[PDB]
Amino acid sequence: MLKAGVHFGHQTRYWNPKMKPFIFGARNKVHIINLEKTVPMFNEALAELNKIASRKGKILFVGTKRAASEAVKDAALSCDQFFVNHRWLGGMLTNWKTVRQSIKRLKDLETQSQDGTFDKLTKKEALMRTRELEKLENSLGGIKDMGGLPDALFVIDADHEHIAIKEANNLGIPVFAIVDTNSDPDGVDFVIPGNDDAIRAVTLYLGAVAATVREGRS
Amino acid sequence: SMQDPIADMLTRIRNGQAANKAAVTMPSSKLKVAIANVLKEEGFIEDFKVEGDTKPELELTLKYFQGKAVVESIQRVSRPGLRIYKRKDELPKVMAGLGIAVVSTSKGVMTDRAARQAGLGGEIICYVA
Amino acid sequence: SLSTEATAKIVSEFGRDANDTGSTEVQVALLTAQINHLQGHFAEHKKDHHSRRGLLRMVSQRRKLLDYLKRKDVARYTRLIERLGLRR
RNA sequence: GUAAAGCGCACGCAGGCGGUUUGUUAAGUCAGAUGUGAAAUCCCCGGGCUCAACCUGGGAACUGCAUCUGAUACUGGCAAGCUUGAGUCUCGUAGAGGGGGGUAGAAUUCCAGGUGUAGCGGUGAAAUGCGUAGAGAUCUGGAGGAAUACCGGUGGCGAAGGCGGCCCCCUGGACGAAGACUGACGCUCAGGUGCGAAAGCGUGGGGAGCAAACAGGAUUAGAUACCCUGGUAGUCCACGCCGUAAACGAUGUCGACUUGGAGGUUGUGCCCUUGAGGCGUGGCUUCCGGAGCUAACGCGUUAAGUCGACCGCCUGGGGAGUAC
Ligand SMILES: [Mg+2]
Ligand SMILES: [Mg+2]
Ligand SMILES: [Mg+2]
Ligand SMILES: [Mg+2]
Ligand SMILES: [Mg+2]
Ligand SMILES: [Mg+2]
Ligand SMILES: [Mg+2]
Ligand SMILES: [Mg+2]
Ligand SMILES: [Mg+2]
Numbered sequence: 003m004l005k006a007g008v009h010f011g012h013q014t015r016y017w018n019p020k021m022k023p024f025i026f027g028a029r030n031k032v033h034i035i036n037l038e039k040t041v042p043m044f045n046e047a048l049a050e051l052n053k054i055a056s057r058k059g060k061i062l063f064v065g066t067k068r069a070a071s072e073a074v075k076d077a078a079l080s081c082d083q084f085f086v087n088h089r090w091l092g093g094m095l096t097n098w099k100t101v102r103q104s105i106k107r108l109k110d111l112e113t114q115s116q117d118g119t120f121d122k123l124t125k126k127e128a129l130m131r132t133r134e135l136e137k138l139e140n141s142l143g144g145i146k147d148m149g150g151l152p153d154a155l156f157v158i159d160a161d162h163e164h165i166a167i168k169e170a171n172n173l174g175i176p177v178f179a180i181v182d183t184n185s186d187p188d189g190v191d192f193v194i195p196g197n198d199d200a201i202r203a204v205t206l207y208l209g210a211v212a213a214t215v216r217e218g219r220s
Numbered sequence: 221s222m223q224d225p226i227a228d229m230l231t232r233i234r235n236g237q238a239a240n241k242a243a244v245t246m247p248s249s250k251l252k253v254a255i256a257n258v259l260k261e262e263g264f265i266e267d268f269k270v271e272g273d274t275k276p277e278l279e280l281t282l283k284y285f286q287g288k289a290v291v292e293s294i295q296r297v298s299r300p301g302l303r304i305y306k307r308k309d310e311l312p313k314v315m316a317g318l319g320i321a322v323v324s325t326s327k328g329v330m331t332d333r334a335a336r337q338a339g340l341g342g343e344i345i346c347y348v349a
Numbered sequence: 350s351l352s353t354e355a356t357a358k359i360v361s362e363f364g365r366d367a368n369d370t371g372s373t374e375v376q377v378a379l380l381t382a383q384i385n386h387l388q389g390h391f392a393e394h395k396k397d398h399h400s401r402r403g404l405l406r407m408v409s410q411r412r413k414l415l416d417y418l419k420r421k422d423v424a425r426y427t428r429l430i431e432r433l434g435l436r437r
Numbered sequence: 438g439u440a441a442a443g444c445g446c447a448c449g450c451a452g453g454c455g456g457u458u459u460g461u462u463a464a465g466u467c468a469g470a471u472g473u474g475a476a477a478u479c480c481c482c483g484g485g486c487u488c489a490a491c492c493u494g495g496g497a498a499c500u501g502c503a504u505c506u507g508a509u510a511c512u513g514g515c516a517a518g519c520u521u522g523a524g525u526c527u528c529g530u531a532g533a534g535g536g537g538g539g540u541a542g543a544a545u546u547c548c549a550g551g552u553g554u555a556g557c558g559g560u561g562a563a564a565u566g567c568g569u570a571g572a573g574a575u576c577u578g579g580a581g582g583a584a585u586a587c588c589g590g591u592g593g594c595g596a597a598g599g600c601g602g603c604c605c606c607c608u609g610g611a612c613g614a615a616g617a618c619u620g621a622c623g624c625u626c627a628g629g630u631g632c633g634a635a636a637g638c639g640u641g642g643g644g645a646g647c648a649a650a651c652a653g654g655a656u657u658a659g660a661u662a663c664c665c666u667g668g669u670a671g672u673c674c675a676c677g678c679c680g681u682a683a684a685c686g687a688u689g690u691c692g693a694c695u696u697g698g699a700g701g702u703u704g705u706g707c708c709c710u711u712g713a714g715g716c717g718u719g720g721c722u723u724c725c726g727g728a729g730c731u732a733a734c735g736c737g738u739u740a741a742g743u744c745g746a747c748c749g750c751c752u753g754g755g756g757a758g759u760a761c
Contacts, residue, residue, distance in 0.1 A: 221455080221522060221623055221624050221691060221692045221693095221746080222455085222456055222522075222692060222746095223456090223624070223625095223692075223746045224454090224692095224745050225457095225745095227693090227744060227745050228694075228744080230744080231693070231743065231744040231745075232693080234694095234743070235694050235695055235742095236694085238729085238743080239695055239696075239728085240696090244694090246693090246694095247457085247521070249457065249458090250457090250458085251511075254510080274519085274520085275520085275521070295744085296744075298512095300454060300455080300512085300745080301453065301454050301747085303466090303512060305465080305466050305511085305512090306466095307468085308468075323510095324466095324511045325510060326467055326468080326508040326509045326510060326511090327508075327509085327510070329510065329511090340467055340468055340508080341466080341468075342466080342510075342511080343510080343511050343512080345511085
């Protein structure tokens, strides 16, 4: 947990009496994530991902926040590991049956622009269909190749991706989040108290967990 | 004012288990402790202890299990201003046996099954199931 | 409330010894003071209802105090009454 | 809480309940036993009428009352203490808390006079009304009554009602601090006692402004109203009476536990106090809100959450808080 010296705590004094059992201190007002009890869960919790991850574990990564977003793609795309960094959809998991309809569309429409099959129609209806991918791939992208609910799941911070967490446990999908102070851990079965952001805190555990998920498959 | 010390212990306990509080404290006394000993030798709390020298304390450590606390139901019975005394064959059966009823017998603060098998009645105290 | 002098003074006079204001007998006397004195303040004005509260309160307290004495020591009780010319 | 329902609030007798340790007792409490608890019913097992209803053998039951023998944890009696409950003291703390007496300035109206001239006032317009007997406006002097701009607020005090200028006098309560002291002296309380907004009633004062009544004027189909011009009671005062209010947090009192965040109020401990600055830690008080509670709204450590002691009240709507 030596590397842990690059994220420490966060959040001034809003916190939540639920994350209290995970606070090192509160210097200069802002609390301090108890890195000491974070280490146990660092591995133990992380190890569990490797489990299902072994059998093409569809580990779905989440995080729409500025920092994470642009990075989530890299960390997750490191393998079968799916991800979503563009605002969670209402039912993209639970309403998969109906949400997938967009996936199919995105796919076929994607091929439209792929080979000689998109070039035609008036610039209007022609360019109109371009827009779709310009957005559909934004959210359906890191899931278009997914064939049903993910083997598991993994989100950066639950307090922001609340919607995602709910759809998961509602379907019966394990949750691994790195919520810090101001966050409800009860919504996660594998809590990892750590800065909800931090340039390092994000990329760190991102690829760190991706390892036992991509490099962890035998 | 504290017209019923017994209840407090019981109330304190249930509230704790619901508050996920590790243990609990309170000004112990003869009965208070004796009662706690029943909760201990039965299985409802981690343990208990009487701190303080001139001022009695009580380290009634609450116990928990899986995704829930142990004591799921604990209320008063022989409350004051309405004391209840029952005979041997007149002893209740908390949760068809799954639970217990702390009773004050002429021998000691036993349990429903206990005092009952011994063959004696006694003032109930609570139905900590 | 009461004159610092007369206060401490009246204490030593009934205290079980010295510097024991909490003393039972002491309370009565010390209380009877403002009681027997307020009479004047109340004799005048009269419509000083709010102030009456304090009187009536401390008044009842004397009773609740004397009853105790008579319950945990009939001796001192029967005595204090005399020196204070109480009981009708 | 809003459905029926928290007494307007206090104080407190009876009554109910009673922190803590030991000894003692053994009344309640438990156990054992002996009486008595009629038989028949009821119940169980078993018989007799071809069965059943029915009749019957035995037992159980008879929840009970008493006596005797014990058991002593718990309630109770007693004796002895204890200190955390309550209270006493010392010292401070803030305050529209109360009764009494003063007192200042701002304005209103009225009176007198100077100046000045044809309006003023009022409304949606008006009109009544006040003005040449000189108003209004303006200035000077004076008379008097009621209320205290600003400070002032999510503020403070109080049992409730309620309480704002300043000054003094008499006076009650709340809070913190360190401690010193008494030693369970406590909580609650039917009846009872006392306090009770405004309006109202009595006697005698006072009376500027406002204003039920009443009187005009206008509005309107009408307008016993809203609006305008006047104006009596009253409002103010002293003592007495009346006891009601959406007397409302529509939420009885006392005690104990149950995550948090934000802010006001006042006390106290500490920090280069070098600062108002910072940290704590008491009482009070707003706002948001979790768990839980709720029919929902919502309440939420000031609960309507989780418990305990005591009290009040509710039992469909109308008739009716009416009659007697
Ligand atoms: Mg109604
Ligand atoms: Mg009602
Ligand atoms: Mg009330
Ligand atoms: Mg019989
Ligand atoms: Mg005893
Ligand atoms: Mg009046
Ligand atoms: Mg009058
Ligand atoms: Mg107050
Ligand atoms: Mg709230």
